[PDB]
Coordinates of C-alpha atoms and ligand atoms in Angstrom, one line a residue:
Chain A
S1 CA 0.1 0.1 0.4
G2 CA 0.8 3.7 -0.3
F3 CA 0.8 5.7 -3.4
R4 CA 3.4 8.1 -4.4
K5 CA 4.5 10.4 -7.3
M6 CA 6.6 7.9 -8.8
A7 CA 9.2 8.2 -11.9
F8 CA 10.6 5.6 -14.3
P9 CA 13.7 3.4 -13.3
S10 CA 16.2 6.2 -14.9
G11 CA 18.9 4.2 -15.9
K12 CA 18.4 3.4 -19.8
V13 CA 18.2 7.0 -20.3
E14 CA 21.4 7.8 -17.8
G15 CA 23.2 5.8 -20.8
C16 CA 22.4 8.3 -23.5
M17 CA 23.0 11.7 -22.1
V18 CA 26.0 13.5 -23.6
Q19 CA 27.0 17.1 -23.2
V20 CA 26.9 19.2 -26.1
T21 CA 28.9 22.6 -26.9
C22 CA 28.5 24.8 -29.7
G23 CA 30.7 28.1 -29.2
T24 CA 30.2 29.1 -25.6
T25 CA 27.2 27.4 -24.9
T26 CA 26.9 24.1 -23.2
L27 CA 23.5 21.9 -22.8
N28 CA 22.2 18.6 -23.0
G29 CA 22.0 15.8 -25.9
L30 CA 20.6 12.4 -26.1
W31 CA 22.8 9.8 -28.0
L32 CA 20.7 6.9 -29.6
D33 CA 22.8 5.0 -32.0
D34 CA 25.0 7.0 -33.7
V35 CA 22.9 10.4 -33.8
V36 CA 23.1 13.1 -30.8
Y37 CA 19.5 14.6 -30.5
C38 CA 19.9 18.4 -28.8
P39 CA 17.7 21.6 -28.8
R40 CA 18.9 23.8 -32.1
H41 CA 19.1 26.7 -29.8
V42 CA 22.8 25.5 -29.0
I43 CA 24.1 27.5 -31.8
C44 CA 22.7 30.7 -30.2
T45 CA 24.2 33.2 -28.4
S46 CA 22.0 34.5 -25.9
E47 CA 21.5 37.7 -28.1
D48 CA 20.6 35.3 -31.1
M49 CA 17.7 34.3 -29.0
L50 CA 15.8 37.6 -29.3
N51 CA 15.2 37.0 -33.0
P52 CA 17.2 34.2 -34.6
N53 CA 17.5 32.7 -37.9
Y54 CA 18.3 29.1 -37.2
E55 CA 19.2 28.4 -41.0
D56 CA 21.0 31.5 -41.4
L57 CA 23.0 30.7 -38.1
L58 CA 23.5 26.9 -38.9
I59 CA 25.2 27.9 -42.4
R60 CA 28.1 29.4 -40.0
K61 CA 28.3 26.1 -38.3
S62 CA 30.7 23.2 -39.6
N63 CA 30.8 19.0 -38.0
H64 CA 33.5 20.5 -36.0
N65 CA 31.7 23.2 -34.0
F66 CA 29.5 20.5 -32.1
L67 CA 31.6 19.1 -29.1
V68 CA 30.2 16.2 -28.0
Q69 CA 31.3 14.3 -24.8
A70 CA 30.1 11.2 -23.3
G71 CA 31.2 10.6 -20.1
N72 CA 34.8 12.1 -20.3
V73 CA 35.6 10.8 -24.0
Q74 CA 34.8 13.0 -26.9
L75 CA 32.4 11.6 -29.8
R76 CA 33.3 12.8 -33.3
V77 CA 30.6 14.6 -35.0
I78 CA 30.6 13.2 -39.0
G79 CA 27.4 15.3 -39.7
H80 CA 24.5 17.6 -38.7
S81 CA 21.2 18.8 -39.8
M82 CA 18.5 20.6 -38.6
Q83 CA 14.9 18.9 -38.2
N84 CA 12.4 21.5 -36.6
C85 CA 13.7 22.6 -33.7
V86 CA 16.2 20.1 -32.9
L87 CA 19.8 19.3 -34.7
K88 CA 20.7 16.1 -35.1
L89 CA 24.7 15.3 -34.9
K90 CA 25.7 12.0 -36.7
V91 CA 28.7 10.6 -34.5
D92 CA 31.1 7.8 -36.2
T93 CA 30.0 5.6 -32.8
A94 CA 27.0 3.9 -32.1
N95 CA 26.1 4.7 -28.0
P96 CA 26.8 1.1 -26.6
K97 CA 24.1 1.6 -24.1
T98 CA 21.1 2.7 -26.4
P99 CA 18.1 0.8 -25.4
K100 CA 15.2 -0.4 -27.2
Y101 CA 13.5 3.0 -28.3
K102 CA 10.7 4.9 -29.8
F103 CA 10.1 8.7 -30.3
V104 CA 6.5 9.4 -29.5
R105 CA 4.3 12.9 -29.2
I106 CA 2.5 12.6 -26.1
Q107 CA -1.3 14.1 -25.9
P108 CA -2.0 16.6 -22.8
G109 CA -2.8 15.2 -19.6
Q110 CA 0.0 12.1 -20.3
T111 CA 2.6 11.8 -17.9
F112 CA 6.0 11.1 -18.1
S113 CA 9.8 11.0 -16.0
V114 CA 12.2 13.8 -16.7
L115 CA 16.0 13.2 -16.1
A116 CA 17.2 16.6 -15.3
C117 CA 20.8 16.9 -16.5
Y118 CA 23.1 19.5 -16.3
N119 CA 26.5 18.9 -18.6
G120 CA 25.5 15.5 -20.0
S121 CA 25.4 14.4 -16.4
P122 CA 22.2 13.1 -14.7
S123 CA 21.1 15.5 -11.9
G124 CA 17.7 14.1 -10.9
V125 CA 14.1 12.4 -12.1
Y126 CA 10.7 12.9 -11.4
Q127 CA 7.4 12.7 -12.8
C128 CA 5.2 15.0 -14.8
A129 CA 2.5 16.0 -17.0
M130 CA 2.1 17.2 -20.4
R131 CA -0.4 20.6 -19.1
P132 CA -3.6 21.1 -21.3
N133 CA -1.9 24.5 -22.1
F134 CA 1.2 22.3 -23.3
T135 CA 3.2 23.7 -21.0
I136 CA 4.9 21.1 -18.0
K137 CA 5.9 22.1 -14.4
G138 CA 9.4 20.8 -14.6
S139 CA 12.7 21.5 -12.4
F140 CA 15.0 23.2 -14.6
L141 CA 18.1 25.7 -14.4
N142 CA 20.3 27.3 -16.8
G143 CA 22.2 24.0 -18.9
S144 CA 19.2 21.6 -18.5
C145 CA 18.2 22.4 -22.2
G146 CA 17.9 19.2 -24.1
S147 CA 17.4 17.2 -20.7
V148 CA 14.2 14.6 -21.7
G149 CA 10.9 12.9 -21.1
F150 CA 10.2 9.4 -21.5
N151 CA 8.1 6.3 -20.6
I152 CA 9.4 3.1 -20.4
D153 CA 7.5 0.0 -21.5
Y154 CA 9.6 -3.1 -19.8
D155 CA 12.6 -2.4 -22.0
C156 CA 11.5 -0.1 -24.5
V157 CA 12.1 3.7 -23.6
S158 CA 9.2 6.2 -25.6
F159 CA 10.9 9.4 -25.6
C160 CA 8.5 12.2 -25.3
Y161 CA 10.0 15.3 -24.3
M162 CA 13.0 17.3 -24.8
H163 CA 13.2 20.8 -22.7
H164 CA 13.8 23.9 -24.7
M165 CA 12.9 26.7 -22.6
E166 CA 11.1 28.6 -19.7
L167 CA 8.3 31.0 -19.9
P168 CA 8.4 34.4 -18.4
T169 CA 6.0 32.7 -16.0
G170 CA 8.4 29.9 -14.5
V171 CA 6.7 27.2 -16.7
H172 CA 8.5 25.3 -19.2
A173 CA 8.1 24.3 -22.7
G174 CA 9.9 21.8 -25.2
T175 CA 9.3 19.6 -28.2
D176 CA 8.9 16.0 -28.8
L177 CA 12.0 14.2 -30.2
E178 CA 11.3 15.4 -33.8
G179 CA 11.9 18.5 -32.8
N180 CA 8.1 19.8 -33.0
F181 CA 7.3 21.9 -29.9
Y182 CA 4.1 20.9 -28.0
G183 CA 1.6 23.9 -28.1
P184 CA 2.4 27.1 -29.8
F185 CA 5.6 27.9 -28.3
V186 CA 8.6 28.9 -30.3
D187 CA 12.4 28.9 -29.1
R188 CA 12.6 32.8 -29.4
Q189 CA 13.4 34.8 -26.2
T190 CA 10.1 36.7 -27.0
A191 CA 6.6 37.3 -24.9
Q192 CA 5.0 33.7 -24.5
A193 CA 2.3 33.6 -22.8
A194 CA 0.5 30.3 -21.7
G195 CA -3.4 29.6 -21.9
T196 CA -5.3 28.0 -19.1
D197 CA -4.2 25.4 -17.0
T198 CA -7.0 23.7 -16.4
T199 CA -6.9 20.2 -14.3
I200 CA -6.9 16.9 -16.2
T201 CA -10.2 15.5 -14.6
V202 CA -9.5 11.9 -15.9
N203 CA -6.2 11.9 -13.8
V204 CA -7.7 13.1 -10.9
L205 CA -10.6 10.7 -11.4
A206 CA -7.6 7.3 -11.3
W207 CA -6.1 9.2 -8.6
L208 CA -9.3 9.1 -6.4
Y209 CA -9.7 5.6 -7.6
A210 CA -6.1 5.3 -6.1
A211 CA -6.8 7.0 -2.9
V212 CA -10.2 4.1 -2.3
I213 CA -7.4 1.1 -3.2
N214 CA -5.2 2.8 -0.5
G215 CA -7.8 3.1 2.1
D216 CA -8.4 6.7 2.2
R217 CA -12.6 6.4 1.6
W218 CA -13.7 9.8 3.2
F219 CA -14.5 11.5 0.5
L220 CA -17.1 8.9 -0.6
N221 CA -20.2 10.0 -1.1
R222 CA -24.1 9.1 -1.5
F223 CA -24.4 10.6 -4.7
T224 CA -23.8 10.0 -8.1
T225 CA -24.5 11.9 -11.8
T226 CA -24.2 12.5 -15.2
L227 CA -21.6 13.0 -17.8
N228 CA -23.4 16.3 -18.8
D229 CA -24.0 17.4 -15.1
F230 CA -20.5 16.9 -13.8
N231 CA -19.1 18.6 -17.3
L232 CA -21.2 21.9 -16.2
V233 CA -19.6 21.6 -12.9
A234 CA -15.9 20.9 -14.4
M235 CA -16.1 23.9 -16.6
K236 CA -16.9 26.1 -13.5
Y237 CA -13.7 25.0 -11.8
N238 CA -11.5 25.1 -15.4
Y239 CA -11.7 21.1 -15.2
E240 CA -11.0 19.6 -18.8
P241 CA -14.4 18.0 -19.8
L242 CA -14.9 14.5 -19.1
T243 CA -15.5 12.5 -22.2
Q244 CA -17.0 8.6 -23.1
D245 CA -13.4 8.0 -23.7
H246 CA -12.4 8.6 -20.3
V247 CA -15.0 6.6 -18.6
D248 CA -14.1 4.0 -20.8
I249 CA -10.3 4.0 -19.6
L250 CA -11.4 4.6 -16.0
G251 CA -13.0 0.9 -16.5
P252 CA -10.5 -1.2 -14.9
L253 CA -10.3 0.8 -11.9
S254 CA -14.2 1.2 -11.2
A255 CA -14.2 -2.8 -11.7
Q256 CA -11.3 -3.2 -9.2
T257 CA -13.1 -0.9 -6.4
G258 CA -16.6 -1.4 -7.6
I259 CA -17.3 2.2 -7.5
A260 CA -19.0 3.3 -10.7
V261 CA -17.2 6.3 -12.7
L262 CA -20.1 8.4 -12.3
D263 CA -20.3 7.8 -8.9
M264 CA -16.6 8.9 -8.7
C265 CA -17.6 12.0 -10.7
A266 CA -20.3 12.9 -8.0
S267 CA -17.8 12.4 -5.1
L268 CA -15.3 14.7 -7.2
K269 CA -18.3 16.8 -7.7
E270 CA -18.5 17.5 -4.2
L271 CA -15.1 18.1 -3.6
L272 CA -14.7 20.9 -5.8
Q273 CA -18.1 22.4 -4.8
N274 CA -17.6 22.1 -0.8
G275 CA -13.5 21.9 -0.5
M276 CA -11.6 19.6 1.3
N277 CA -12.6 21.1 4.7
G278 CA -8.9 20.7 5.9
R279 CA -8.6 17.1 5.0
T280 CA -6.2 15.4 2.9
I281 CA -6.4 12.9 0.2
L282 CA -3.4 10.6 -0.5
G283 CA -1.1 13.0 2.1
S284 CA -2.4 16.1 -0.6
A285 CA -4.8 19.3 0.1
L286 CA -5.4 19.4 -3.4
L287 CA -6.9 17.3 -6.1
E288 CA -3.7 15.5 -8.1
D289 CA -4.0 15.3 -11.7
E290 CA -0.3 13.9 -12.8
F291 CA -1.6 10.3 -12.3
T292 CA -3.2 8.8 -15.4
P293 CA -5.3 5.8 -15.2
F294 CA -2.5 3.9 -16.2
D295 CA 0.0 4.9 -13.6
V296 CA -2.7 4.4 -11.2
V297 CA -2.8 0.6 -12.8
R298 CA 0.7 0.3 -12.8
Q299 CA 1.5 1.3 -9.8
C300 CA -1.5 -0.7 -8.0
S301 CA 0.2 -3.9 -9.7
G302 CA 3.8 -3.6 -9.7
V303 CA 4.5 -3.6 -13.1
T304 CA 8.3 -3.8 -13.6
Chain B
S1 CA 13.0 27.5 -12.0
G2 CA 10.3 25.1 -10.8
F3 CA 10.9 23.0 -7.9
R4 CA 9.9 19.0 -7.9
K5 CA 9.8 16.3 -5.5
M6 CA 12.9 14.7 -6.8
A7 CA 14.6 11.4 -6.8
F8 CA 18.4 10.8 -7.5
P9 CA 18.9 8.9 -10.9
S10 CA 18.5 5.3 -10.1
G11 CA 20.9 3.9 -12.8
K12 CA 23.5 2.8 -9.8
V13 CA 20.9 1.2 -7.8
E14 CA 19.5 -0.8 -10.9
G15 CA 22.7 -2.7 -11.6
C16 CA 22.5 -3.9 -8.2
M17 CA 19.4 -5.2 -7.9
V18 CA 19.0 -9.0 -7.5
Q19 CA 15.8 -11.4 -6.8
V20 CA 16.2 -13.8 -3.8
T21 CA 13.8 -16.7 -3.2
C22 CA 13.6 -19.4 -0.6
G23 CA 11.0 -21.6 -0.6
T24 CA 7.9 -19.9 -2.0
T25 CA 8.9 -16.6 -0.6
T26 CA 10.6 -14.4 -3.6
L27 CA 11.7 -11.1 -2.6
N28 CA 14.5 -8.4 -3.6
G29 CA 18.4 -8.2 -3.1
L30 CA 21.2 -5.9 -3.1
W31 CA 24.1 -7.1 -4.9
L32 CA 27.2 -5.4 -3.9
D33 CA 30.6 -6.8 -4.5
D34 CA 30.2 -11.0 -3.5
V35 CA 27.4 -10.6 -1.1
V36 CA 23.7 -10.4 -1.8
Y37 CA 22.0 -8.3 1.2
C38 CA 18.0 -9.0 1.6
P39 CA 15.5 -9.2 4.6
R40 CA 15.8 -12.2 6.7
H41 CA 12.1 -12.5 6.7
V42 CA 13.0 -14.6 3.2
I43 CA 13.2 -17.6 5.5
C44 CA 10.1 -17.3 6.5
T45 CA 6.7 -18.5 5.7
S46 CA 3.5 -16.3 6.3
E47 CA 2.9 -18.2 8.9
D48 CA 6.2 -18.0 10.2
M49 CA 6.2 -14.6 10.5
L50 CA 3.1 -14.6 13.4
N51 CA 6.0 -15.6 16.1
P52 CA 9.5 -16.4 13.6
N53 CA 12.4 -17.9 15.8
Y54 CA 15.1 -16.6 13.1
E55 CA 18.4 -18.4 14.4
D56 CA 16.3 -21.8 14.8
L57 CA 14.8 -21.1 11.1
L58 CA 17.8 -20.2 9.4
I59 CA 19.5 -23.9 10.8
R60 CA 17.1 -25.2 8.4
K61 CA 18.6 -23.6 5.7
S62 CA 21.6 -24.3 3.2
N63 CA 23.6 -22.2 0.8
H64 CA 21.6 -23.7 -2.0
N65 CA 18.2 -23.2 -0.7
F66 CA 18.6 -19.4 -1.5
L67 CA 18.4 -19.1 -5.0
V68 CA 19.7 -15.8 -6.4
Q69 CA 19.2 -14.7 -10.0
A70 CA 20.8 -11.4 -11.5
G71 CA 18.7 -10.3 -14.8
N72 CA 18.1 -14.2 -16.1
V73 CA 21.1 -15.9 -14.8
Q74 CA 21.8 -17.4 -11.5
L75 CA 24.4 -16.7 -8.7
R76 CA 26.0 -19.4 -7.0
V77 CA 26.0 -18.7 -2.9
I78 CA 28.8 -20.0 -1.3
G79 CA 28.2 -18.8 2.1
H80 CA 25.0 -17.2 4.4
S81 CA 25.0 -15.1 7.4
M82 CA 22.5 -13.0 9.5
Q83 CA 23.3 -9.4 10.6
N84 CA 20.7 -8.1 12.7
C85 CA 17.5 -8.3 10.4
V86 CA 19.4 -8.8 7.0
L87 CA 21.0 -11.7 5.6
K88 CA 23.9 -12.0 3.5
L89 CA 24.5 -14.2 0.9
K90 CA 27.9 -14.4 -0.1
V91 CA 28.2 -15.5 -4.3
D92 CA 30.8 -16.5 -6.2
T93 CA 30.9 -13.6 -8.7
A94 CA 31.3 -9.9 -7.5
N95 CA 28.6 -7.7 -9.1
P96 CA 30.7 -6.0 -11.9
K97 CA 28.2 -2.9 -12.0
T98 CA 28.8 -2.3 -8.0
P99 CA 29.1 1.4 -7.8
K100 CA 31.4 3.3 -5.0
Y101 CA 29.2 2.9 -2.0
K102 CA 28.7 3.2 1.9
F103 CA 25.8 2.1 4.2
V104 CA 24.4 4.6 6.2
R105 CA 22.2 5.0 8.8
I106 CA 20.1 8.2 9.1
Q107 CA 18.5 10.7 11.3
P108 CA 15.0 11.3 11.3
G109 CA 13.8 14.1 9.2
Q110 CA 16.6 12.8 6.5
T111 CA 15.4 12.0 2.7
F112 CA 16.3 9.4 0.6
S113 CA 15.3 7.7 -2.7
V114 CA 13.8 4.5 -3.1
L115 CA 13.8 2.2 -6.1
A116 CA 10.6 0.1 -5.8
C117 CA 11.5 -3.2 -7.2
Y118 CA 9.6 -6.5 -7.7
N119 CA 11.4 -10.1 -8.5
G120 CA 14.5 -8.3 -8.8
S121 CA 13.2 -5.5 -11.3
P122 CA 13.0 -1.7 -11.0
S123 CA 9.2 -0.6 -11.4
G124 CA 9.9 3.2 -10.1
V125 CA 11.8 5.6 -8.4
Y126 CA 10.8 8.0 -5.8
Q127 CA 11.4 10.2 -3.0
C128 CA 10.9 9.6 0.6
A129 CA 11.9 10.5 4.2
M130 CA 12.7 9.3 7.5
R131 CA 9.6 10.3 9.7
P132 CA 10.1 11.8 13.1
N133 CA 8.3 8.3 14.5
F134 CA 10.9 6.2 12.3
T135 CA 8.5 5.1 9.9
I136 CA 8.7 6.3 6.0
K137 CA 5.4 6.6 3.7
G138 CA 6.8 4.9 0.5
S139 CA 4.6 3.0 -2.2
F140 CA 5.1 -1.1 -1.5
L141 CA 3.2 -3.6 -2.8
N142 CA 4.0 -7.4 -1.9
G143 CA 7.3 -8.6 -3.2
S144 CA 8.9 -4.9 -3.1
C145 CA 10.4 -6.4 0.6
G146 CA 14.4 -5.5 -0.2
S147 CA 14.1 -2.6 -2.2
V148 CA 16.6 -0.4 -1.1
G149 CA 16.7 3.5 -0.1
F150 CA 19.8 5.7 -1.2
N151 CA 21.3 8.9 -1.4
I152 CA 24.2 9.6 -4.2
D153 CA 27.0 12.1 -3.8
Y154 CA 28.3 12.5 -7.3
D155 CA 29.7 8.5 -7.7
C156 CA 29.3 7.3 -4.3
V157 CA 25.9 5.5 -3.4
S158 CA 25.1 5.8 0.4
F159 CA 22.8 3.1 1.1
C160 CA 20.3 3.9 4.0
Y161 CA 17.5 1.7 3.8
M162 CA 16.0 -1.6 3.1
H163 CA 12.3 -2.3 2.8
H164 CA 11.2 -5.0 5.2
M165 CA 7.3 -4.8 5.8
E166 CA 4.0 -2.5 6.2
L167 CA 2.3 -1.7 9.7
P168 CA -1.5 -2.5 9.6
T169 CA -1.6 1.7 9.3
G170 CA -0.1 1.3 5.9
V171 CA 2.8 3.2 6.9
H172 CA 6.3 1.3 6.0
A173 CA 9.4 -0.1 8.4
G174 CA 12.7 -1.0 7.4
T175 CA 16.3 -1.5 8.3
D176 CA 19.7 -0.2 7.4
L177 CA 22.1 -2.2 5.3
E178 CA 23.2 -3.4 8.8
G179 CA 20.2 -5.0 9.7
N180 CA 19.1 -2.4 12.5
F181 CA 15.4 -1.2 12.2
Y182 CA 14.7 2.1 12.3
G183 CA 12.9 2.5 15.2
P184 CA 11.4 0.3 17.5
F185 CA 9.9 -2.4 14.5
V186 CA 10.3 -5.9 14.5
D187 CA 10.1 -8.4 11.6
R188 CA 7.3 -10.0 13.1
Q189 CA 3.7 -10.3 12.0
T190 CA 2.0 -8.5 15.4
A191 CA 0.5 -5.4 16.6
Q192 CA 3.1 -2.5 15.8
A193 CA 1.5 0.9 15.8
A194 CA 3.6 3.9 14.9
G195 CA 4.0 6.9 17.0
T196 CA 3.2 10.8 16.4
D197 CA 4.1 11.8 13.0
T198 CA 5.3 15.2 13.7
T199 CA 6.0 17.7 10.9
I200 CA 10.0 18.2 9.7
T201 CA 10.0 21.8 10.8
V202 CA 13.7 22.4 9.3
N203 CA 12.3 20.8 5.9
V204 CA 9.3 23.4 5.8
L205 CA 11.4 26.1 6.4
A206 CA 14.0 24.9 3.3
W207 CA 11.0 24.6 1.3
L208 CA 9.6 27.9 2.2
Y209 CA 13.3 29.1 1.0
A210 CA 12.9 27.2 -2.2
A211 CA 9.4 28.8 -2.7
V212 CA 10.8 32.0 -2.3
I213 CA 14.0 31.3 -4.4
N214 CA 11.1 30.4 -7.2
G215 CA 8.9 33.1 -7.0
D216 CA 6.3 32.0 -4.7
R217 CA 6.6 34.8 -1.8
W218 CA 2.8 35.7 -1.3
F219 CA 3.4 34.2 2.4
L220 CA 6.4 36.0 3.6
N221 CA 5.0 38.9 6.1
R222 CA 6.3 41.7 8.3
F223 CA 7.0 39.8 11.6
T224 CA 9.8 37.7 13.7
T225 CA 9.9 35.9 16.3
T226 CA 12.3 34.1 18.7
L227 CA 13.1 30.2 18.7
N228 CA 11.5 29.5 21.9
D229 CA 8.5 31.8 20.4
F230 CA 8.4 29.2 17.1
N231 CA 8.7 26.1 19.5
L232 CA 5.8 27.1 21.3
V233 CA 3.2 27.3 18.4
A234 CA 5.7 24.4 16.4
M235 CA 4.4 21.9 20.0
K236 CA 0.6 22.9 19.3
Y237 CA 1.2 22.3 15.6
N238 CA 3.2 18.5 16.4
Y239 CA 6.1 20.0 14.4
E240 CA 9.4 19.0 15.8
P241 CA 11.1 21.5 17.8
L242 CA 13.6 23.9 15.8
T243 CA 17.2 24.1 17.3
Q244 CA 20.2 26.5 16.4
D245 CA 21.9 23.5 14.6
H246 CA 18.7 23.8 12.6
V247 CA 19.2 27.2 12.4
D248 CA 22.8 27.0 11.4
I249 CA 22.0 24.7 8.8
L250 CA 19.4 27.2 7.2
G251 CA 22.0 29.7 7.0
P252 CA 23.4 29.5 3.5
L253 CA 19.5 29.7 2.4
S254 CA 19.2 32.4 4.5
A255 CA 22.2 34.3 3.0
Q256 CA 21.0 33.4 -0.7
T257 CA 17.6 34.8 0.0
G258 CA 18.2 37.7 2.6
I259 CA 15.8 36.3 5.0
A260 CA 16.8 36.1 8.3
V261 CA 15.7 32.3 9.6
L262 CA 13.7 33.8 12.6
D263 CA 11.8 36.1 9.7
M264 CA 10.7 32.8 7.9
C265 CA 10.1 31.1 11.3
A266 CA 7.2 33.6 11.7
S267 CA 5.8 33.5 8.4
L268 CA 5.7 29.6 8.9
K269 CA 4.1 30.7 12.4
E270 CA 1.5 32.5 10.5
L271 CA 1.1 29.8 8.1
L272 CA 0.1 27.3 11.0
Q273 CA -2.5 29.6 12.7
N274 CA -3.9 31.2 10.0
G275 CA -3.6 28.1 7.3
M276 CA -3.2 28.4 3.6
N277 CA -6.8 30.3 3.1
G278 CA -7.2 28.1 -0.3
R279 CA -3.7 29.3 -1.6
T280 CA -0.5 27.4 -2.7
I281 CA 2.9 27.6 -2.5
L282 CA 5.2 25.1 -5.3
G283 CA 2.0 23.9 -6.1
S284 CA 0.9 22.8 -2.6
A285 CA -1.9 23.0 -0.2
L286 CA 0.3 21.6 2.5
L287 CA 3.4 22.7 4.2
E288 CA 6.1 20.1 2.9
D289 CA 8.4 18.4 4.7
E290 CA 10.5 16.5 2.6
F291 CA 12.9 18.6 1.3
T292 CA 16.1 18.7 3.5
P293 CA 18.0 22.1 3.1
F294 CA 20.4 20.0 1.4
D295 CA 17.9 18.6 -1.1
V296 CA 16.8 22.9 -1.4
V297 CA 20.1 23.7 -2.1
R298 CA 21.0 20.8 -4.6
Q299 CA 18.3 21.2 -6.6
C300 CA 18.4 25.0 -7.0
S301 CA 22.1 24.4 -7.9
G302 CA 21.6 21.8 -10.1
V303 CA 24.3 19.5 -8.6
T304 CA 24.8 16.3 -10.7
Ligands
LIG1 C1 19.5 25.5 -21.7 N1 20.0 25.0 -21.0 C2 19.3 27.0 -21.2 N2 20.3 27.5 -20.4 C3 20.3 28.7 -20.4 C4 19.5 29.9 -20.9 C5 18.5 29.5 -21.8 N3 18.3 27.9 -22.0
LIG2 C1 7.8 -8.4 1.2 N1 8.1 -8.6 0.1 C2 6.6 -8.9 1.2 N2 5.8 -9.5 0.5 C3 4.8 -10.0 0.7 C4 4.5 -10.1 2.1 C5 4.9 -9.2 3.4 N3 6.4 -8.6 2.8

């Protein structure tokens, strides 16, 4: 028993982190096979970031200008190319620690683990979610760009995020491993404001099921609701609309606990309207939305 | 910017996890050099756990009864011994992935990362703290015994915890790597109730400094207090007493933010008396106590 904000074991990803330097800028790269992936803003000076023309800046760069170091040994760069907002540095050596991997573009509400790195070295691992406004709330200092987000399915790492920037509000923006930003963000130092950070309703419901499984049951009420009634309340509280797809995804948790999804919605509806009254659920005084229904099943069953 | 409950990168520890089976019981072991460490209750049937005599049960066990598997390859057990509540299984092969390591016994209030494992395989990593009542609030299912807690200092892993049991209240108890339980707990299936789970005051203060560094400043007030006045309030709210040692440890955070430790105590005093009023600090609606002052400095500086 017990329910924690758990990250995937990071070992498989640690074996892929390298340092990339271009001029005076050092950030992280991801070395998979004979390619090193990193944010293209590694070629920019802090000044260039104001209005960069990446194609033009890249013309002034040669393979020998990209310094790639894996541990304390230098990798030889034999090619370079830009794919959207990432640079792909072809090296002459395949990473011997390359795990089975995929590049996936996640949807909002999906969670992933981040291996925060500096100078190609791992500093920590934590669990995040792609917010509905396509930002993430991470922990990233200067030098952390190129740190990656991922999920693991037994032995295959699905990379879903690469860190590129912090908005003026302290929230984070980045790309998938094809270099496409999540959301409308651009790799430029300009006014970029995030939209409404709504709550991921299906994740809150999953976490309420995790609470019931783990013995925290005070919030269970005698009520039920409908998808339409619940959604009127969800709109009022800046919660994402709940769809029949979300109800179907919660089916296994509903089956395990014997609590119908709409009854759990009615419990959540009362928590939104009445508040927590100074009580906690799974050691939290707010409704947690960074556990997907899959994460709740995974953690409650001990998937390795 | 951003502040997350961050665990250490788990790779160095993943390379040490093995599966240990005795009879019908399978749990995890930690393989360092040519020794595999595991909870001694691996020799018990669920029935034996009611009132086990470990020395007597161990007489009926031979080296060949302890099945140790690292990945999918079997290790040969050439010796076994009991040290307090852990078994040390001498194997004929040194773990080639043994990192630099130490065995440390932590004090309450100290944090560590847990690599939850099942069948010798890592499932997830999360951050914990040794509670003042010597329990931990983990996420452990059946089969997770032998999972370990650790801290990393650059390349040296300091192992501080090995999971042994869950109390009837869903909280966890375990030992250091010398087999000595934290707190008064015993490896027996009997009535073991935990004491008061007080709040780790010095960690809350560290987290308030982390909040100021990261821009969450609404709780800063115009007041100050004394150690004695603050402690009267701390006692009332089941917070641990703050000592001059804790004030000294918070010195670097006080210096960085320009907020005197006693002024931060006065802010915390008002938060305890007035509550949060529906507001949050670092995305939390409660006062977080599982970040030490060292963790706040580490995360705010990007130690790798
Ligand atoms: C990412 N490494 C980064 N560091 C400093 C400024 C901007 N981005
Ligand atoms: C630890 N692995 C454990 N599993 C089942 C019951 C008790 N302890």
